[PDB]
RNA sequence: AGGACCGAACCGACUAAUGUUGAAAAAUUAGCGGAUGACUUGUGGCUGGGGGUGAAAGGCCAAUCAAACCGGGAGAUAGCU
RNA sequence: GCUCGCCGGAAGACCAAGGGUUCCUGUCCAACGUUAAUCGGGGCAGGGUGAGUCGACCCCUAAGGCGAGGCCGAAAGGCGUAGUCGAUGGGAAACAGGUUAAUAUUCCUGUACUUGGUGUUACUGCGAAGGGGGGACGGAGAAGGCUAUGUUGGCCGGGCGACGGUUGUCCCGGUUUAAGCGUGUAGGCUGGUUUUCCAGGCAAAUCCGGAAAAUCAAGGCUGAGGCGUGAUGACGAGGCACUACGGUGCUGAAGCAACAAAUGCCCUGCUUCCAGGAAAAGCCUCUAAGCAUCAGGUAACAUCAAAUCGUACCCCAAACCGACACAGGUGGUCAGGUAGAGAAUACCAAGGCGCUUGAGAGAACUCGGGUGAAGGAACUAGGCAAAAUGGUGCCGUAACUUCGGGAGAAGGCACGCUGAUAUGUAGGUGAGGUCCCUCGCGGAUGGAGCUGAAAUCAGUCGAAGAUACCAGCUGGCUGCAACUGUUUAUUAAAAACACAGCACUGUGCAAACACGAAAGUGGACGUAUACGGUGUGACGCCUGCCCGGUGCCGGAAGGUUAAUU
RNA sequence: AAUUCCUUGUCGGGUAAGUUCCGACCUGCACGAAUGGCGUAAUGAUGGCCAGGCUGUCUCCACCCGAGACUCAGUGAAAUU
RNA sequence: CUUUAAUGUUUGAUGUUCUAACGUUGACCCGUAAUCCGGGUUGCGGACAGUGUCUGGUGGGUAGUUUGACUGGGGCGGUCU
């Protein structure tokens, strides 16, 4: 649920939290944990490639199963867990054979609900089936772009795509971006929407809340001297076209220079 | 509970006086600010010069920065002293 | 040597880093020491650093580095796999006492302990570069139970006072004792046991995980401290003999209890929160390939081994970094007494210093301070500076407000000492004894003794009772920015920079973008409720007109238009 | 007005006297709505202004305690020329 | 030799389809106790993509340079035969 704190201090007036008691108040499954060392926006050379990344709270990586290739085996949801590596929560599931795994938490899933993957699975939220069997006009998430590699689309808090058409070995989809894409009609997708919808209603409330996530402060560029096109000037001049560093527009200019796929796109967006 | 309050350590450096061939190539004294946090700190590590890093001042990069230092081209050129 | 003064959360003590003989002894005073110098971190010579348990080395690994082949690249070379290095992390074991001019948890004494090798005996399913477990981990907060430690009493020993009094409810001192072993408590977690079954744990598995039944609820694990042992010992205030007053042998009394009590231990705990909290090995198990009157495994005993390097000394400083014996800078550990909320502050203990030029005089003027008649900001760019306020408790507290605040608003009263209430109360602590008992480090009862506020009443001294150090000036109008924060190390801390929040825009993932001749890496082990860029900058009421120009996003009828032909 | 040249704009408030400050007027030299506009509690070593209190800031300095200055002994610089 | 059709070949454009180059930062296998790499199998793409040479456009993102003289100081202005 959404809760607004009280203004007992400057830094707590506009802060808003997303309270969810269903989350497990304990440690996660260690066998499914992995080190995740922070980078700082730097690469193998040691140079900052992506700015505004630094510090933050330590984090462990939860091995999530985006493929769902354990077909023909029911699995029950044990508990919902908080995942820092992503916006959405995860669910610890237990298969009949004794195997445990992490998955994305659908909209209205709970602990004790049963799910299954494959072609003969039931059409219910949480189940995973190839889109060749998913009815048209339905809603799915964690979509695969190439069969066998794992879900890549609709993985965020409250995201979902909609199957709108199916002609042959391909199926057309409208993504949360509004793009009308089509993929092969053999990619696995999971029914339902990822449930953390109220995640967007959050309000950090203070600067330190952005630093906990690893986001470093962002300096504009208008007051930036030899270091940026907008540069400087006596006062607040800014008498040039908006432009990135390295000299690119950033206020309308499109930068998609792929030309390789150019077949799966139909209604790019807007 | 709190980028909450007062206030030592700790990190800072707003004012004043001294000092200005100083005790000190930026400090001392009396006060001052923050002090559970975007805190502070130890050890080690990465980022290299038209490049790095930069809560951005053209700031910092070994008392040196509107392009570091050493060496070399090099006895640069100097219609000027 | 007798006094004086200073530090005493250090100006004391123990270390790392760093330095590298500055340590000790003797000797010398040319130079060095901001003076002299018999002295010295100076010169010369000699002497000094003793480890199975401390540390390094070693085993393991993080960031990261190198990187067989390999991918890439004009050469140089770059990235990176397998792997190998890499602590600031993890991983076996020693305490006390004594001793040297200089070393010791290293030597001596006493008591112990760990990991291994070999051998003997006995019982035996052993085996990994694999699987599983464990190792293994955050912040804040809350108490409770303990100890270090301290205070008092008691006991022991000594003492009866340079000046009035001081054989007593007087004074001084001491009252210490370890790891280990044995008990396994306060308290913490956990439901256990047996059999069957299984798409899982890369193959297997008795192990892990999972499923299904039965049978019991007490089973285990962890765990400070305490007690006992260690210890008929040691140390011991002090004496007896030598005593070159430099010390050595021997002897050596009491060696108890209560109260208070940590930031330390129980605690890697418990509760709670979101920002969701390393890895690997050692260790405990599981089997596979394979080996079985073998080999190996387990227990006991005996025996052997545990090498190598470091250890001196300074280490908030005269020995490190600062050109100096430089008001500087430098990380960790120990943390006494009185008052106190306190590691503040004042005065002291232990302990260590008086800061390497002195003497004398007592002008101007400067520096650092104290006081001040009457006035009280008239000073001045400006109340700069200085003065002033300053505490606990009670009462009381405005506009405005985002209802949290404003607010310690402002403002007013009371504070000492003695006695009594109460020969020291409320409270805390908790003995003996008694009762019970699964007979224990138990529970109940018991209230001794110890400790001990705050308040009231009366009385009393002083000019002054928050008497010292310590310790908010306050209020009113208003500009800028919301706020906490950040910045020109070394003249600018701000109205600038960040900021949460808003918006535009790009990006469908081999994403955009960025670093890179490239490979590739980051973005991200993320996937549009995401990422990047730009501008604005909490919140509230809002954000109007203009697309001619520039730019961006689209489109087409035609025109013009490169190489090429 | 952090924007106003003319300018110490004009009126009023506060003061014995106010180029500053506060509040209104609009004639906006040359505000203006995310290079955001108008307000805004709270905060500020922020800017400006007025009070109470307090004082050697001053009227107007005087005295005193200490370190230098001065003298004696010892050691023994510098800029400049 | 003036003329035009169904053909054959010729080459030109467009479109569809295919697979064999090429791609695969898809899946499985081996080297191999290796998310690299390579090989093999398969699938999806597929003569597109991407690369090389040439070429037009864009291009302060980054460089190399220029930006006159006289002048009752210089600049503005004016002037230069």
From Swiss-Prot:
Function: One of the primary rRNA binding proteins. Located near the base of the L1 stalk, it is probably also mobile. Required for association of the 30S and 50S subunits to form the 70S ribosome, for tRNA binding and peptide bond formation. It has been suggested to have peptidyltransferase activity; this is highly controversial.
Protein name per the record: Large ribosomal subunit protein uL2
Miscellaneous remark of the record: This protein can be partially replaced in vivo by its H.marismortui (HmaL2) or human (L8, from the 60S cytoplasmic ribosome) homolog.
Molecular function terms from GO: RNA binding; rRNA binding; structural constituent of ribosome; transferase activity; zinc ion binding
Organism annotation: Escherichia coli (strain K12)
SUPFAM superfamilies in the cross-refs: Nucleic acid-binding proteins, Translation proteins SH3-like domain
Lineage: Bacteria, Pseudomonadati, Pseudomonadota, Gammaproteobacteria, Enterobacterales
Region (Disordered): 27-52, 220-270
HAMAP family found in the cross-reference section: Ribosomal_uL2_B (MF_01320_B)
UniProt cross-references to Pfam families, sorted A to Z: Ribosomal_L2, Ribosomal_L2_C
Positions of post-translational N6-acetyllysine modification: 240
Source species, domain of life: Bacteria
Family the entry assigns: Belongs to the universal ribosomal protein uL2 family.
């Amino acid at each position: 649920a959404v809760v607004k704190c009280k203004p007992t201090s400057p830094g707590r007036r506009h802060v808003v939290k997303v309270v969810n008691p269903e989350l497990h108040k304990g440690k996660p499954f260690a066998p499914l944990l992995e080190k995740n060392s922070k980078s700082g926006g730097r690469n193998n050379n040691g140079r900052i490639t992506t700015r505004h990344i630094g510090g933050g709270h330590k984090q462990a990586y939860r091995i999530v199963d985006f493929k769902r290739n354990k077909d023909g085996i029911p699995a029950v949801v044990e508990r919902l867990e908080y995942d820092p590596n992503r916006s959405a929560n995860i669910a610890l599931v237990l298969y009949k054979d004794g195997e445990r795994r992490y998955i994305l938490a659908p909209k209205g899933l709970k602990a004790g609900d049963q799910i299954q993957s494959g072609v003969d699975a039931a059409i219910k939220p949480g189940n995973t089936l190839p889109m060749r069997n998913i009815p048209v006009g339905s809603t799915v998430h964690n979509v695969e772009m190439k069969p066998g590699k794992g879900g890549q689309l609709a993985r965020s808090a409250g995201t979902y795509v909609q199957i709108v058409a199916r002609d042959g070995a391909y199926v057309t989809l409208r993504l949360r971006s509004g793009e009308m894409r089509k993929v092969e009609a053999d990619c696995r997708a999971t029914l339902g929407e990822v449930g953390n919808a109220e995640h967007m209603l959050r309000v950090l409330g203070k600067a330190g809340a952005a630093r906990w996530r690893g986001v470093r402060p962002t300096v504009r560029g208008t007051a930036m001297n030899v270091d940026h096109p907008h540069g400087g000037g006596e006062g607040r001049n800014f008498g040039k076209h908006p432009v990135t560093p390295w000299g690119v527009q950033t206020k309308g200019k499109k930068t998609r220079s792929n030309k390789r796929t150019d077949k799966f796109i139909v209604r790019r967006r807007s």
